[PDB]
Amino acid sequence: AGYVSQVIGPVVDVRFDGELPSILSSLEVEGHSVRLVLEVAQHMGDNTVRCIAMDSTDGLVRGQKVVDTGSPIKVPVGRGTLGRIMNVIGEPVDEQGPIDAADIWSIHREAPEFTEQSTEQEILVTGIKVVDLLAPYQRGGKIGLFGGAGVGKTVLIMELINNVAKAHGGFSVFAGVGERTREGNDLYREMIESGVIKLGAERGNSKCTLVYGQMNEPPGARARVALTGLTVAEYFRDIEGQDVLLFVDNIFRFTQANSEVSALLGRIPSAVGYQPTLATDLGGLQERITTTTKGSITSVQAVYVPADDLTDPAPATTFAHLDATTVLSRSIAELGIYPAVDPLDSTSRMLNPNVIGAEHYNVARGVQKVLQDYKNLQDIIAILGMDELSEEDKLTVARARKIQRFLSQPFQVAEVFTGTPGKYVDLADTISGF
Amino acid sequence: ATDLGGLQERITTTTKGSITSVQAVYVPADDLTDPAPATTFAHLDATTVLSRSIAELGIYPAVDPLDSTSRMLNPNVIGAEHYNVARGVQKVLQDYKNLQDIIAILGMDELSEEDKLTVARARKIQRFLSQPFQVAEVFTGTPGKYVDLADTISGF
Amino acid sequence: ADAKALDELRKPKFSSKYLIQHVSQKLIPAVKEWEKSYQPPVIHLGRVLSVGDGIARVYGLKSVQAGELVCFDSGVKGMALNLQADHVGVVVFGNDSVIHQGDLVYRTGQIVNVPIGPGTLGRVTDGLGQPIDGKGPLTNVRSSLVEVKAPGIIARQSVREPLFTGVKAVDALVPIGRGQRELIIGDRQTGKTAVAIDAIIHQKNCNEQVPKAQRVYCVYVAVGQKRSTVAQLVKLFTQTGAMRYTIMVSATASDAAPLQFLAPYSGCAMAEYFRDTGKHGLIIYDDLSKQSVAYRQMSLLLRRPPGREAFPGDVFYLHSRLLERAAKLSKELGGGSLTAFPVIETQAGDVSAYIATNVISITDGQIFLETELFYKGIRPALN
Amino acid sequence: KALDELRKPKFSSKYLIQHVSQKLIPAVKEWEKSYQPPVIHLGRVLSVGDGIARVYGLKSVQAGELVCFDSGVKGMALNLQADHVGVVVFGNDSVIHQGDLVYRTGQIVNVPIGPGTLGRVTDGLGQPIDGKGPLTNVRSSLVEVKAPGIIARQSVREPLFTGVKAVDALVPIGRGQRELIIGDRQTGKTAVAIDAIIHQKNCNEQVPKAQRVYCVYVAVGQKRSTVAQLVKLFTQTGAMRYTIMVSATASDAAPLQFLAPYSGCAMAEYFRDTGKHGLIIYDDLSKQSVAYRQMSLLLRRPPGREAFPGDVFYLHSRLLERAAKLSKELGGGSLTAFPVIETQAGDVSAYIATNVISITDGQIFLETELFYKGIRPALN
Amino acid sequence: PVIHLGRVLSVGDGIARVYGLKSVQAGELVCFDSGVKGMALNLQADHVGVVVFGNDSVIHQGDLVYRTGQIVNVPIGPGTLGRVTDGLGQPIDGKGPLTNVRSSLVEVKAPGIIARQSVREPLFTGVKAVDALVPIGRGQRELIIGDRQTGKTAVAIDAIIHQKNCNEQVPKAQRVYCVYVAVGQKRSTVAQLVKLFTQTGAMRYTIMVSATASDAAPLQFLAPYSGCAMAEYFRDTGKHGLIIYDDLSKQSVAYRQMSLLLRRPPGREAFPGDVFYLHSRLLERAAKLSKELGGGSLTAFPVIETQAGDVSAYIATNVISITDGQIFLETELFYKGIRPALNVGLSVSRVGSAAQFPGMKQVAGTLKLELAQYREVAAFAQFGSDLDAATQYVLERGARLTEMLKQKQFAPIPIERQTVAVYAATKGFLDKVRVQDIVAAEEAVISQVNPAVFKILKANGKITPALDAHLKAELRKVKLPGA
Amino acid sequence: LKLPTAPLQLSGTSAQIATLLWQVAAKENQLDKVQDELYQFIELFKQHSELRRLATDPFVPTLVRTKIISSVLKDSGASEITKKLFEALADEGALSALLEVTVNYEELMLAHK
Ligand SMILES: Nc1ncnc2c1ncn2[C@@H]1O[C@H](COP(=O)(O)OP(=O)(O)OP(=O)(O)O)[C@@H](O)[C@H]1O
Ligand SMILES: Nc1ncnc2c1ncn2[C@@H]1O[C@H](COP(=O)(O)OP(=O)(O)OP(=O)(O)O)[C@@H](O)[C@H]1O
Ligand SMILES: Nc1ncnc2c1ncn2[C@@H]1O[C@H](COP(=O)(O)OP(=O)(O)OP(=O)(O)O)[C@@H](O)[C@H]1O
Ligand SMILES: [Mg+2]
Ligand SMILES: [Mg+2]
């Protein structure tokens, strides 16, 4: 009912002689080599809408028929999407047939309202000792994961998927926002061998939904693929009633893709070249990740800092939403300590004695004090001597070294290639053990 | 980049004849990062970079001995007796610059006389790159010198 | 094509009418067969020409005041910012995805206003005064404008009364007068709201011990904050009893940037009810640095030129006309007061930023919260 | 007065007179016959200049379609707007005038791919510039192809040997990964990339035919003297028997330098898709982005952080994600990319340098401080 | 005399769009019917853009604009000497009309290659930090670049004041007539310089072209060109000129105002694309003409203000490219007690010693070499590491030499006195003297040394061997403080 | 092809239509029929508010706006130059240029004599 008016890169103008589609509605270009889905960005006037394409616009002709779907991008949600790879517009990329959809949900959604919100602010038990003691995870919170390569981030992702499914009974969604396709395939094959994704007839016993928007996709497809990951996690929260994990892998690439679609739509860039709507394009994502009366969504979001600059507006806007940080370090990984969570750099807002109690607080405040006193004397051990310093100062060195070792833990998803069995550690056994 | 590229790609040696081009390039604020000098760098076979810090030291011509790069500096082009002297002069002048971080702070007493020898060798090399020009007789006040190629390799 | 040459086309100069009368007997039959393809014409109503970026361009609306509440047929409010010759550009107080080209825009006839009064005490409203606490509409209340001019020089007096915060470092070292503005400025996670929450809980302990004229009625405005933090704060005020004296204006991070830009003016108008009736107000603008970011978004989307930090240039007047409304009134105006506590988030201790130095040159003092004293456990980390 | 509503007009088309002229001059009694402009598969040049032709008409042209001017100079329909087409010109725009006829060719941009491209030095559009005749044993293939998805790939395991000891020990490179050679000017960027191409000539005569690796060197924005020095070096060593050279030099138009990494990748994607192994080297990815920034500022697309287009990340990611290691049911072939990014004063915080660091797997940082210390390759 | 008429379409911010005036030239003076003048700058197809020489409040919509037929011109000649004029010619000192004068264009093509000769004769500033280290020949453009209050104006005023001292002693041909163009300055500030120049006597040879901050932006853009046209009268008729453009930094800001309001697209720092051409058109008119064209010269002194010593500024980098030399003035050298605060390590003169005093070409060669040795050894004794006693000799002698280059702000020393002062410091005769009273020791060296030994060094221009020994044998029969 | 030259040259996008309107009316010798048919349309907008709704109102469809002007300019006062211009000005919504294209038609007509 509408026809293509302009094609300027990834930005398509469609002209509707009848009534216009709503902003954020989905438009299908009738007749094209690949399925081209447009999302309405604005009403330009003169019966024209401006759209951002979810695929390539090469081969698009002015006058091509465009069919309005009457709704935003609608993706399959349910338990049938578990263990599948899905793209932004809901198509299966894993090449295992159609997706057995319980429902088809719009990926655009307002945040849960004020009466629907939870006021309680409790702790999500993860079974990992170092992030249950020193940097606890808020149930319904946002967690910055400051990992990288070779710090065992992928094993930490799959162990969080495992222990939340095993203990708390909730599923997981992985939103690969702007991921490399070599790394997105490496995650898929690592999840198959570690048991969190199963293939074939045992597909329903998988615990994670992969929602992938790759780097070679246009900036509109990467900017909306984190909202496709929300909508799968919001079905488990609002219909299944579960404590869902979400993994927005590289929340910076969500910002970076939304900054590209603002630049292509002709908007004047804000401070540091970011979009004027960076606070509200990021805050519109993060406010759907919350606890409601039905269930909760907890998101572990990998955070990239652009120029090693925490005052850059993309991490500074992101850190206003984050309720905990888990920093993975190579220095902890070179000591054989796995998981490589830095016990001092990792922070949580759940770590004060009014939400976790004074018993749990003083242990974690006491553990962090001991390793701080041990690791600021490492420039007086090497230049004076190990047997030089006092018997009390080396009592801390003996106590910290058997705490720095005790933050290690064998993981259940890592036991198919390490031999040692995995061990879920409860919260009371971590406080009393430390 | 394409206005500049349309000009430079005509200044070439063809099978008919040869154009040996010498282009001065002004860098705006002693800034080779600036895009108008930085686009010119990919067009040239020899980029003599002149520095203000060599000029303020009194060494004239104020050629940066490290930043000046030529495509004639392969050993299979100028021989090995020219390539190893040029690669050896650049090594002593780079070691001195890594030592001059600590000379201007401490003062050349704790280098164990292996690094004290390469400071005095580079300081002789720095002045020996200076040369009176025949057109700067009115400026420098000295008659200019034409140094042959064999006498440069023999001296350094 | 000068203007002296086009007004000559006012007077008739044809002297030949062989198709003036020909189409006049055919125009009305031609218009009549295309009537179901005509939208009805619009003069005092409005029709949306173009909507996008949270700004609607509205044809018509011949009698809108500048800065007036307009209402779309979707139920969403707007504010007529610029009346132009051909359209009126409104900014949408809500989600612009529900507004279409061709939608009717209605006139409310009133410049942008919020409900103020005694019945807004105890409630959680949005940036426009609509209550989001779910416990009904606002009763025992009346509408007042959100862009009231501040009282002048002769309508003020000096601050005399001491408005106890209840914080030990504050009331001893940087004590707060009752008609004063005090900036709470610090880095992220430095107890900025903690100092402003303890000020609000403290008035509940003092209001039940003072004789009805020295009572302080607090107002908390949250701009750009997560809904969960706002909901965890209404639970804390309800369980301490501080909600009886507190209004909670909330424009969270998911809300539209014109709702976050307007929420401190909406809350200041509700707190000005107590200033203008001889009572005493306390207002906290938590993250006024987030209200300037929301106003920077609306100015860049209106294609206004960037500034020093890409801010509109009138971002000083954004906060100066806001914080000048926190005054101590004179005895002929009732003697009421309004005490403001703006909150500014600072990046890495840098107080020489644009929005930080603006509010410092507006407010009467500062409460600097150092992030190194906060890490050492000295809390409140008063520099 | 009642006529004040029409005092000033407003037009939704800048080229209103070119629609009015298509209805007034065919109303003359003479020119009702034989004189009417075709607009569907033809076009008229409205404006020329700086390698952009604004073209009225071409109603049925596709986005990215190769169009032809009546002088034989080709072009790509890049802006498709409501009244005109913005055409980036594949040559000098001096031969194009206002009112020239623009024909659409029906085809999106194509390059010859196949075994006939080996040994040949082509331009940014596939036409040979070494003067040895046309490309014989080739076939036409698209230039901007979709990169292979998740299931089409497998894990990068087989090593690609650069022959450089600093690389092959410290920064190991696998068949199917994309490694950035980033550094300053004259830090040995090409030295590392030419050593990779020369070493695959040595390795190819000692491995079976399924394990041979065929190189493609894309020279963007270099001069013809340097490119001819590199064909002479590749012929003296014998590495031209496995190397394609795609050369869009500095005098070429900015659409040729923009399309040459995509033209060389499509020539290199032939070996990946048929089970063999490829090695694609972009001499200057940064130079390509400067050429793409030229077309977008001239097509009046909105400027970004360094005046680059918003999709300039999508420019390089869509190119570099085409370097994959394919799965065993797609032949198992591979394509290894070596983008080259020239930094200025060694900062990797530059807009284009931050983009390619994100897209690629690793980086080979070459530092000019180590270059004067005798280290070579000055690998950080 | 048919006069073309243009109707004003709209007038705002000192710019008036005019309908009609098809015959008007680009850069033509127009006349509004309010009496205020204008200049047609961008001739568009539908209107003319006119910058208004004055206050645009008197111009209404539909006012009549007459063209005057003429490109913008100013009165040039000897009748402008002594008078304070505004941005285009008209005198503002209240002394009547400019008598004995002639109207010439302000935008003249600069003299080309075949109209020059080599800059060989010196222009003495009277500032001995300048005349020794960065000497300036006649026909050379020299930048005085510095900070907000680094004494840049003082260096320029001392060049003007010193020419009056030279013009009373030279013959009629080699007399320097100064022009001081004050762009964007305070009017009180300009009136303190006319008060200084009549008290000094320098106003006999000085033209004062004043475009203050209250003037319109096309009056301050155009005032360097109108002052250069007054200064080019002396260059074109065989005499010698000296033009000082105080704050060309403020001319570019006034040119950025007209460009931004004529809707020209902004470049770096919202500046016009042809800003470089704004100053290279002007400064290339400072030439030394050949003897076929009279032999006359024009010496320029542009003044550029930097912000925090940021010479990497857009307009600052442009003028360093145009001018021959550079007098860089530093803020921290100013407060260390070094006045004038000249950065000797950054101040060059591209003409060099080809056009300097021969009596200081041999004496100040070792001055700038011993000061080059003084600079790097003072960076190392800044820490307090160690001493060498040959490092401490050049660290002690250059401290006499830095203290020797200091000068009083309103007194310009003659070239003969400066060479004697530099001789007494470079031949060791001002050793055995404390470093603190060399500012007062050299008053003895000028006074007690014979007043007839300066005459021989002035007439010869060079210390002859019959004078090189005779004055060093008089630099011992002098009584220095302390000793 | 070749058209007559306009007597005086004019500016663009409304005075450029009047130049082309003058050129096809000088070829057909209709320089005062097409001129006076313009003056009738200046009057016709003053009479009928629904005719000037087809030039100011942006919400009339372009299918309606071109099928009123084609269906009232029939069978009387056609001249094939007024008829073909005003369907072109209605196809693009440029019917509000009708005052401004008439004034520049008069300056071409006055310079023709
Ligand atoms: N005096 C105090 N003693 C102990 N904990 C405190 C104190 N004040 C605040 N906190 C705690 O410190 C943390 C940060 O304080 P708060 O949230 O008030 O800071 P903020 O400036 O509002 O930070 P944000 O930028 O996250 O809004 C919270 O967990 C809070 O409960
Ligand atoms: N390993 C090496 N040993 C010796 N010389 C080397 C080595 N690598 C590079 N060079 C030399 O360094 C110079 C510059 O290196 P090269 O041109 O290969 O680097 P580049 O980064 O591509 O430079 P450009 O910026 O000019 O493109 C050349 O003379 C080259 O031969
Ligand atoms: N050599 C000097 N000795 C003593 N005082 C000096 C000297 N040079 C300048 N001054 C004084 O220092 C102050 C600044 O000098 P001046 O006003 O000439 O500087 P400027 O660079 O023109 O600064 P402005 O930005 O005000 O124009 C004045 O009071 C001036 O008299
Ligand atoms: Mg807070
Ligand atoms: Mg190279």
In order, the DSSP letters of A298-358 are: EEEEE---TTS-TTSHHHHHHHTT-SEEEEB-HHHHTTT-SS-B-TTT-EETT-STTTSHH
D287 touches chain B (CB under 8 A): yes
- Measured distance CA(C6)–CA(A58) in Å, rounded: 48
> Which ligand places an atom closest to the C-alpha of E154?
3
- Measured distance CA(E97)–CA(B57) in Å, rounded: 56
Using a 6 Å cutoff on CB, does residue C279 contact ligand 1?
no
Question: Phi-psi category of C117—alpha, beta or left, where left has phi over 0 and alpha has psi -120 to 50?
Answer: left
* Same domain (yes/no): D97, D226: no
CB C326 within 8 A of CB C283: yes
B9 vs D254: CB contact, 8 Å cut-off?
Answer: no
Question: How distant, in Å, are the alpha carbons of D7, D92, E5, E268, F106 from that of C5?
Answer: 11, 46, 17, 43, 10
CB A173 within 8 A of CB A246: yes
- CB neighbours of residue A45 within 10 Å: 19
* Same domain (yes/no): A52, A105: no
Answer yes or no: is C354 within a domain: yes
A369: exposed, middle or buried (Cβ count in 10 Å: 0-12, 13-18, 19+)? middle
Q: Tell me the two tokens of residue E364.
A: 């100040």
- Measured distance CA(C212)–CA(C279) in Å, rounded: 8
Q: Tell me the two tokens of residue D42.
A: 């033809």
* Same domain (yes/no): A65, A84: no
Nearest-CA distance D331 → chain F (Å): 56
Who among F58, F61, F93 is closest to A17 (CB)? F61
Q: Domain ends where: A23, A39, A72?
A: A72
CB F73 within 8 A of CB F37: no
Count of structural domains, chain A: 3
* Same domain (yes/no): E350, E386: no
Q: Which pairing describes strands C337-346 and C280-286: parallel, antiparallel, or unpaired?
A: parallel
Q: Tell me the two tokens of residue E438.
A: 């060399």
Domain of A189: which CATH number? 3.40.50.300
Whether residue E68 is annotated as binding a ligand: the answer is no
- Measured distance CA(D14)–CA(D83) in Å, rounded: 8
- CB neighbours of residue C185 within 10 Å: 25
Residues with Cβ within 8 Å of B68's Cβ and at least 6 positions away in sequence, in order, are B46, B47, B48, B49
Return the HEC string of D103-132.
EEEEEECEEEECHHHCCCEECCCCCECCCC
Which protein residue has the closest C-alpha to ligand 2 atom 16?
D188
Domain of A31: which CATH number? 2.40.10.170
- Measured distance CA(F42)–CA(F39) in Å, rounded: 5
Count of structural domains, chain D: 2
* Same domain (yes/no): C250, C180: yes
Q: Tell me the two tokens of residue E313.
A: 């500024």
- Measured distance CA(E385)–CA(E377) in Å, rounded: 11
Count of structural domains, chain E: 3
Mutate: best of C73, C87, C226, C233, partner A, most A CBs <10 A: C226
Residue E34 C-beta-side C-alpha neighbours within 13 Å: 19
CB C49 within 8 A of CB C101: yes
CA angle A237, A240, A245 (to 5 degrees): 40
CB E374 within 8 A of CB E394: yes
Which residues in chain D belong to E strands, given as ranges?
42-47, 52-57, 65-69, 74-80, 84-89, 101-108, 110-113, 121-122, 139-142, 159-160, 173-174, 179-183, 213-220, 243-248, 277-282, 334-342, 362-366
Which residues in chain B belong to E strands, given as ranges?
46-47, 69-70
CB A289 within 8 A of CB A113: no
Q: Tell me the two tokens of residue A44.
A: 């330009």
* Same domain (yes/no): D93, D149: no
Q: Which structural domain, as residue segments, surrounds residue C37?
A: 24-110
* Same domain (yes/no): C177, C247: yes
E252, E308, E246: which is closest to E281 by C-alpha?
E252
Residues in chain B: 156
Answer yes or no: is C11 within a domain: no
3-class DSSP state of C81: strand
- Measured distance CA(A291)–CA(C235) in Å, rounded: 15
Q: Which string of b and e fits C69-79 if b means at least 16 CB within 10 Å?
A: bbbbbeebbbb
Answer yes or no: is D8 within a domain: no
- CB neighbours of residue E283 within 10 Å: 23
D12 touches chain C (CB under 8 A): no
- Measured distance CA(F22)–CA(F30) in Å, rounded: 9
Catalytic residue among A50, A84, A153, A237: A153
* Same domain (yes/no): D132, D89: no
CB C364 within 8 A of CB C337: no
Answer positive or negative: Cα dihedral of C166, C172, C174, C176: positive
The DSSP line for D223-272 is -HHHHHHHHHHHHHHTGGGTEEEEEE-TTS-HHHHHHHHHHHHHHHHHHH
Domain of D73: which CATH number? 2.40.30.20
Question: How distant, in Å, are the alpha carbons of B102, B129, D169, D369 from that of B122?
Answer: 15, 10, 34, 17
Question: How distant, in Å, are the alpha carbons of A75, A260, E428, E436, F81 from that of E421?
Answer: 90, 68, 11, 16, 93
Catalytic residue among E235, E350, E434, E476: E350
Question: How distant, in Å, are the alpha carbons of A37, B139, C138, E97, E99 from that of A74?
Answer: 11, 79, 37, 84, 87
* Same domain (yes/no): A192, A283: yes
Answer yes or no: is D11 within a domain: no
User: After which residues is chain E discontinuous, taking C to N > 2.5 Å?
Assistant: none
Q: What are phi and psi of E263, to 5 degrees?
A: 70, 20
* Same domain (yes/no): A37, A84: no
Q: Tell me the two tokens of residue C309.
A: 């930090």
CB A408 within 8 A of CB A423: no
Q: Give the DSSP H or E segment for E184.
A: strand E176-185
Residues in F touching C31 (Cβ below 8 Å): 50, 68
Peptide bond into A21 cis (omega under 30): no
Q: Tell me the two tokens of residue A311.
A: 């005052």
Residues with Cβ within 8 Å of C48's Cβ and at least 6 positions away in sequence, in order, are A43, C56, C57, C58, C59, C72, C99, C100, C101, C102, C103, C105
Q: Where are the alpha helices (DSSP H) in C250-370?
A: 257-275, 288-301, 315-323, 354-360
Q: For tokens 């590495």, name the residue.
A: D239
Q: Tell me the two tokens of residue A99.
A: 């997706």
C91, C126, C128: which is closest to C300 by C-alpha?
C91
Answer yes or no: is C90 within a domain: yes
Q: Give the DSSP H or E segment for E260.
A: helix E249-261
Nearest-CA distance F102 → chain E (Å): 17
Q: Fill in the DSSP letter of residue A224.
A: S
Residues with Cβ within 8 Å of F2's Cβ and at least 6 positions away in sequence, in order, are none
Is residue A394 annotated as part of the catalytic site, yes or no? no
Whether residue E154 is annotated as binding a ligand: the answer is yes
CA E21 to chain centroid, in Å, comes to 39
CB A186 within 8 A of CB D155: yes
- When computed from its CA atoms, the radius of gyration of chain E, rounded to whole angstroms, is 25
Q: Which residues pair with E185 in a beta bridge?
A: E212
* Same domain (yes/no): D230, D351: yes
Residues in chain F: 113
Answer positive or negative: Cα dihedral of E62, E64, E65, E69: positive
Peptide bond into E481 cis (omega under 30): no
Q: Where are the alpha helices (DSSP H) in F1-113?
A: 15-27, 33-47, 49-56, 62-72, 82-91, 98-110
* Same domain (yes/no): E275, E320: yes
- Measured distance CA(A172)–CA(A165) in Å, rounded: 8
* Same domain (yes/no): A224, A257: yes
C259: exposed, middle or buried (Cβ count in 10 Å: 0-12, 13-18, 19+)? buried
Residues with Cβ within 8 Å of E83's Cβ and at least 6 positions away in sequence, in order, are E91, E93, E95, E98, E207, E208
Which residues in E196-342 belong to E strands, given as ranges?
206-212, 240-246, 297-305, 325-328
Residues with Cβ within 8 Å of C284's Cβ and at least 6 positions away in sequence, in order, are C193, C196, C199, C200, C218, C219, C220, C221, C340, C341, C342, C343
- Measured distance CA(C5)–CA(C7) in Å, rounded: 6
Q: Tell me the two tokens of residue A277.
A: 């709507």
Catalytic residue among A180, A267, A375, A405: A180
- Measured distance CA(A42)–CA(C329) in Å, rounded: 47
* Same domain (yes/no): D67, D140: no
Q: Fill in the DSSP letter of residue A393.
A: H
* Same domain (yes/no): C363, C239: yes
- Measured distance CA(B24)–CA(F54) in Å, rounded: 65
Domain of B132: which CATH number? 1.10.1140.10
CB D378 within 8 A of CB D168: no
- Measured distance CA(E203)–CA(B140) in Å, rounded: 39
Which protein residue has the closest C-alpha to ligand 2 atom 25?
D185
A11, A61, A33: which is closest to D104 by C-alpha?
A61
Chain F (43-72) residues lying within 8 Å, Cβ to Cβ, of chain D: 45-46, 49, 52, 55-56
Peptide bond into D377 cis (omega under 30): yes
E324: exposed, middle or buried (Cβ count in 10 Å: 0-12, 13-18, 19+)? buried
- Measured distance CA(E391)–CA(B103) in Å, rounded: 15
3-class DSSP state of B58: coil
A317: exposed, middle or buried (Cβ count in 10 Å: 0-12, 13-18, 19+)? buried
* Same domain (yes/no): C197, C279: yes
Q: Which structural domain, as residue segments, surrounds residue E376?
A: 357-483
* Same domain (yes/no): C43, C131: no
Q: Which structural domain, as residue segments, surrounds residue B130?
A: 73-156
Which protein residue has the closest C-alpha to ligand 2 atom 24?
D186
Q: Domain ends where: D66, D87, D107?
A: D107
- Measured distance CA(C43)–CA(C36) in Å, rounded: 19
Distance between start and end Cα atoms, chain D: 78
E1, E16, E409, E48: which is closest to E196 by C-alpha?
E409
Q: Tell me the two tokens of residue E239.
A: 């005499």
Using a 6 Å cutoff on CB, does residue D287 contact ligand 2?
no
Q: Tell me the two tokens of residue C247.
A: 């209004």
Q: For tokens 């032949």, name the residue.
A: D331
Determination technique used:
cryo-EM
Q: Tell me the two tokens of residue E96.
A: 């009547």
Whether residue A183 is annotated as binding a ligand: the answer is yes
- Measured distance CA(C195)–CA(C171) in Å, rounded: 11
Residues in A touching F93 (Cβ below 8 Å): 46
Residues with Cβ within 8 Å of E87's Cβ and at least 6 positions away in sequence, in order, are E53, E209, E210, E211, E215, E218, E219, E220, E222, E223, E226
Answer yes or no: is D14 within a domain: no
- When computed from its CA atoms, the radius of gyration of chain B, rounded to whole angstroms, is 18
Distance between start and end Cα atoms, chain F: 25
CB E58 within 8 A of CB E36: yes
* Same domain (yes/no): D259, D200: yes
* Same domain (yes/no): E318, E251: yes
Counting from 1 in the atom list of ligand 1, the atom nearest the Cα of C380 is: 1
* Same domain (yes/no): A111, A209: yes
Q: Fill in the DSSP letter of residue A47.
A: T
Q: Domain ends where: C82, C110, C138?
A: C110
Nearest-CA distance D223 → chain B (Å): 6
Q: Which string of b and e fits A164-173 if b means at least 16 CB within 10 Å?
A: bbeebebbbb
CB D123 within 8 A of CB D222: no
Answer yes or no: is D38 within a domain: yes
Q: Domain ends where: C76, C110, C144?
A: C110
B29 vs E312: CB contact, 8 Å cut-off?
Answer: yes
* Same domain (yes/no): C187, C88: no
A16: exposed, middle or buried (Cβ count in 10 Å: 0-12, 13-18, 19+)? buried
